[PDB]
Write a protein that binds this ligand. Structure first.
Ligand code: AGS
Ligand code: AGS
Ligand code: CL
Ligand code: MG
Length: 195
């Protein structure tokens, strides 16, 4: 993950999405001195950054958790954060609320999908089913990560918007194993569980 990449995480609850964030993305971000802002809508990430009580905290604290009209506020605050700390990763553990399939696209959502680099903000979006998010999220993504599924509608979406090969290989992943799809290079890795 480049610091201004868009990364999508896809898998049913308990498949290991938050674990990957906590144990794979966050530590590597930290090691490069890459800032992040975690937008938690379900706390679970309490120990990974300053727990914010205001928009000012989002801007000023280097590693920050936010407990979530609001997306535009969050987005504006993140842009100001990035100007202070350099490229920042905005991590959203419930992309289902702002990026939902068949929803409109505000200027801020559009910016987040098409103008990341310019705003100095990477994105990690997390979702339980592939068909929860707008197909344009899959087109705009740089890396798509998928855990096991054989739900036939999900296979169809993966095949149509991502890769027919990924749709095949997704069906055989063991627990905590995950497929990585590089949208740009069009390659596929099958990764073992994180330690
Ligand atoms: N690579 C892993 N190794 C060991 N346990 C894991 C691993 N990945 C996920 N888990 C465990 O499986 C459970 C679910 O993980 P979560 O990250 O909470 O799943 P999520 O619903 O996709 O978000 C937790 O108990 C984790 O500790
Ligand atoms: N992606 C998965 N998530 C959770 N459990 C799994 C997964 N894949 C295989 N298993 C479980 O692992 C066990 C069987 O593995 P094998 O039959 O040895 O292959 C069963 O309990 C399966 O349900
Ligand atoms: Cl709008
Ligand atoms: Mg989770």
């Amino acid at each position: 993950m480049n610091p201004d990449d868009i990364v999508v995480l896809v898998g049913r609850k308990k498949s290991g999405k938050s674990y990957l964030i906590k144990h794979y993305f966050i530590p590597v971000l930290k090691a490069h001195k890459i800032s992040y802002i975690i937008d938690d809508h379900n706390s679970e990430y309490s120990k990974f950054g300053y727990n914010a009580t205001s928009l000012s905290d989002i801007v000023s604290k280097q590693y920050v958790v936010v407990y979530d009209d609001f997306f535009e506020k969050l987005w504006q605050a993140s842009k100001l954060h990035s100007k202070k700390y350099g490229t920042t990763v905005l991590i959203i553990d419930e992309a289902y609320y702002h990026f939902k399939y068949k929803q409109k696209v505000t200027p801020a959502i559009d910016e987040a999908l098409h103008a990341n680099r310019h705003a100095g903000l990477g994105l990690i979006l997390s979702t339980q089913r592939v068909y929860d998010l707008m197909p344009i999220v899959y087109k705009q993504a740089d890396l798509i990560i998928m855990f096991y599924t054989r739900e036939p509608n999900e296979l169809r979406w993966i095949s149509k918007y991502i890769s027919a090969e990924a749709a095949e290989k997704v069906k055989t992943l063991k627990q905590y194993h995950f497929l990585i799809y590089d949208v740009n290079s069009q390659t596929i890795k099958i990764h073992k569980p994180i330690l």
